[PDB]
């Protein structure tokens, strides 16, 4: 099993009524753990095990950083909209994070997107940015001309993210590392149906043109899926069900 920590940022320029101008949500694996937006202007816990293990100085410090991060996202979104010569509402998104593999190896990723398409993609193993056009190339040169920015990001991806990931995994060990077996059943619908539900983690392999169903959230922390046309693997446990 691989575990991952990542944070998003969502910036909407000139938002319609109701939509926040800035949103930042953090996840461990499939679980929201932190949240922040331009309306509350506060970093708040999104899982109970986060609020029990993080002292108030944690939320106070990263709220201050997030207030700065919100301001720069407004600034960076303005720079894009004056390089593309764009008017109206536009989107700017960010995703940084890391993964901790089963064998102990780690991966690190950071990328930005403008209006829903890949804009800038970082390579921490070469200290370079993969730009998607000339506007992104301009920003790529500004960042690559700053060694501190390159070393700073590489450090967070390889060192601090993995440290936070392990710290969060201990905080929510009861929830993130649990295993619930799927409840598998077969149905003979007509117009054959190996339906399973109530399992966690959502990584599940089902087999027998074979039609598959999405792994959807049930709403109580478990997931559900099906396979149409039975073998089911989940957390290294294989189940067989006959006709």
């Amino acid at each position, epitope marked *: 099993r691989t575990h991952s920590l990542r944070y998003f940022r969502l910036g909407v320029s000139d938002p319609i009524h109701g939509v926040p101008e800035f949103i930042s949500v953090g996840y461990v694996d499939s679980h929201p753990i932190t949240t922040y937006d331009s309306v509350t202007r506060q970093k708040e816990p999104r899982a109970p095990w986060m609020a029990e293990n993080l002292a108030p100085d944690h939320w106070e410090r990263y709220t*201050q950083l997030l207030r700065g991060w919100q301001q720069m996202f407004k600034v960076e979104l303005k720079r894009l909209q004056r390089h593309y010569n764009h008017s109206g509402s536009h989107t700017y998104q960010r995703m940084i994070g890391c993964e901790l593999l089963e064998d102990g190896s780690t991966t690190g990723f950071l990328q930005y997107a403008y209006d829903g398409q890949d804009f800038l993609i970082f390579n921490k193993d070469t200290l370079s940015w993969l730009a998607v056009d000339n506007v992104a190339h301009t920003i790529k040169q500004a960042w690559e001309a700053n060694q501190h920015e390159l070393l700073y990001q590489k450090n967070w991806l390889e060192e601090e993210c993995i440290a936070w990931l392990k710290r969060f995994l201990e905080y929510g060990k009861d929830t993130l590392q649990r295993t619930e077996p799927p409840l598998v059943r077969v149905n003979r619908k007509e117009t054959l149906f190996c339906k399973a539900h109530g399992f966690y983690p959502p990584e599940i392999y089902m087999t027998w043109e074979i039609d598959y169903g999405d792994i959807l959230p049930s709403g109580d922390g478990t997931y559900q899926a099906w396979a149409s046309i039975c073998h089911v693997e989940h957390s290294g446990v294989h189940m067989v069900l006959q006709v």
Partner: T-cell receptor
Amino acid sequence: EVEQNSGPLSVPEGAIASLNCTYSDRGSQSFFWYRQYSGKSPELIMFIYSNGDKEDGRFTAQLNKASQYVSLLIRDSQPSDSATYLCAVRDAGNMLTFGGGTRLMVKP
Amino acid sequence: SAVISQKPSRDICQRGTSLTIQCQVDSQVTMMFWYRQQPGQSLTLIATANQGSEATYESGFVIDKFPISRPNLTFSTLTVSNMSPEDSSIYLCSVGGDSLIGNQPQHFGDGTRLSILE
């Protein structure tokens, strides 16, 4: 946390001057060296993130995160390098903690 | 990278008056700090300049003594209210963090040398 430097230091000209710095917070990530002449402001001379050595001209920054000490080596030091050298350490919250500084006197 | 301009460079002031000094940056940087330092002594952090709200002060420095206002990321003021000779020092403006050119390290302005006389 806390950053600990020494006080007054004297180094012969041409010899290597070594300023050492220790910190208490194990979770600190970046380490900075600032130089400040008497009437001027601090000036960043270099920084280091990972274990090992980092050379920039006559300067050499050494980080040992296990033993939690950061060093700055000034090879072939000259009286121009006579100043107060500040050790700064950054924590997870990107807050910077300064040491008391070590004044270096390079005798000509 | 970021150029920090402190105004005034120096000032000689009477006890019992107030002086507002300011800090202007040529670019937008997230974090901004105010320090004080005696010549030949250690660098002492006064507070952290928060944009649009009150400053986060260190131990010993209170908001009514050193009011700090930061309307935007490039500008902030520090006021020494009811000045006394004990307040004579060199007040430094620092800036660091994220910017349009990436995460910059903390840099310092040339400071304001304040000498309050009886």
